Amino acid sequence: SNLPKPSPEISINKGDEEPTEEEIKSSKKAMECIKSSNIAASVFGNESNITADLIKTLLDSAKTEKNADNSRYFEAELLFIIELTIALFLFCKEEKELGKFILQKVFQLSHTKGLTKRTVRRMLTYKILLISLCADQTEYLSKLINDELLKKGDIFTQKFFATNQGKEFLKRLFSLTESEFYRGFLLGNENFWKFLRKVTAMKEQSESIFEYLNESIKTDSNILTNENFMWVLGLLDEISSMGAVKKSIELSLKSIQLTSHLLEDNNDLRKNEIFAIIQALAHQCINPCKQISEFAVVTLEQTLINKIEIPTNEMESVEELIEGGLLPLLNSSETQEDQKILISSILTIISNVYLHYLKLGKTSNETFLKILSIFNKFVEDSDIEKKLQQLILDKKSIEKGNGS
Structure with missing residues (x-):
């Protein structure tokens, strides 16, 4: 929106001392003269007039200490100064020292005490605009992310991020990733992905976040690196767990x-993270919502049956999918209500992938003994016993089929 204009100390609208009518008329004449002078369109009109000296003199001229004399206009005059300097700097092409000058000076001004929350909300957009324009100033971006975007939480609440100002702020912030210069810091810094987790915990920003993340994945696999896998995977895991039993369920299925x-996306995924994928997908099946579990139980089977490649050097045997990937889910003790009936579903997926890879023919003798052992880990339950009653017929039939 527009700037906050500097207010006067007393006001009136049609020892008391009103203004006199003749001097009121004189001041109106003064306003008419100044408006006829075109002060705005003169000193900032022609492109040739703007230069570095004007920027330095303008930015150095702003007041910095609150006084009783200047309580009217301290908060607004600063914002006017930074907007003027950034607007004039947008015409200037140089990035050697002028941009660093404005950046250091505005970061010095922003940290001053006593400012109302609106001014600090406004200054961050100017900061991110300046970071986007300039280059090779990663230390100040780190300072902004650590201090002015994570430590100060009460200033930046959900409703401020809800409005279009916050949406444009996030748009500019995520546009900073695709830049050639600042991608180096943004791949694997802990603070940035922690802030991403924080905003994903909010519910208004979920759709835009998923749109940005899906787009960045789909153009290329460059964002995925070995040193930042678990953070982004936790991000999609958090987004997936946003059930409520209204429209966000479809976004969850998309996630x-x-x-x-x-x-x-890439064939060089290391052994640590494939199990993270399987764990993250399988952990969604325990959600209270039936729709998300119904989609999870099919998508996990699809991923295990289509996109895995045993014979590469990552996995020595197919058993590592179950021994490595799906094993930690079943290990869940002291779970009274949340352990009763889910186990049959994951055992069904285990049986299905066993049938597929046994048709393909790459297992060994000990594998069926070991999965029989994991069946014996859960056999005393009544429903699991009834489900296990029918294991033997399918085992015998699939044993007879592929060989014959």
């Missing part, structure tokens, strides 16, 4: 489809 599709 599940994205993390399903994450495997085929």
Whole structure:
């Protein structure tokens, strides 16, 4: 919106001392003269007039200490100064020292005490605009992310991020990633992904976040690196767990489809993170919502049956998918209500992938003994016993089929 204009100390609208009518008329004449002078369109009109000297003199001229004399206009005059300097700097092409000058000076001004919350809300947009324009100033971006975007939380609440100002701020902030210069810091800094987790915890910003993340994945797999895998995977895991039993369920299925599709982006995924994929997908099946579990149970099977590649040097045997990937879910003790009936579903997926890879023929003798052992880990339950009653017929039939 527009700037906050500097207010007067007393006001009136049609020892008391009103202004006199003749001097009121004189001041109106003065305003008419100044408006006829075109002060705004003169000193900032022609492109040739703006130069570095004007920027330095303008930015150095702003007041810095609050006084009783200047309580009227301290907060607004600063914002007017930074807007004027950034607007004039947008015409200037040089980035050697002038941009660093404005950046250091505005960061010095912003930290001053006593400012109202509106001014600090406004200054961050100017800061991110300046970072986007300039280059090779990563230390100040780190300072902004650590201090002025994570430590100060009460200033930056959900409702400020809800309005279009926050949306444009996030748009400019995520545009900073695609820049050639500042991508180096943004791949794997802990503070940035922690802030991303914080904003994903909010509910208004989920759709834009998923749009940005899906786009950045789909153009290329460059954002995925070995030193930042778990943070972004936790990000999609947090987005996937946003059930409520109204429209966000579809966004959750889109997120599940994205993390399903994450495997085929690059062949050089290390052994640590494939199990993270399987764990993240399988952990969604325990959600209270039936729709998300119904999609999870099919998407996990699709990912395990289509996009995995045993014979590469990552995995020595297919058992590592279950021994390595799906094992930690079943290990869940002291779970009274949340352990009763889910186990049959994951055992069904285990059986299905066993049938597929046994049709393909790459297992060994000990594998069926070991999965029989994991069946014996859960056999005393009544429903699991009834489900296990029918294991033997399918085992015998699939044993007879592929060989014969």
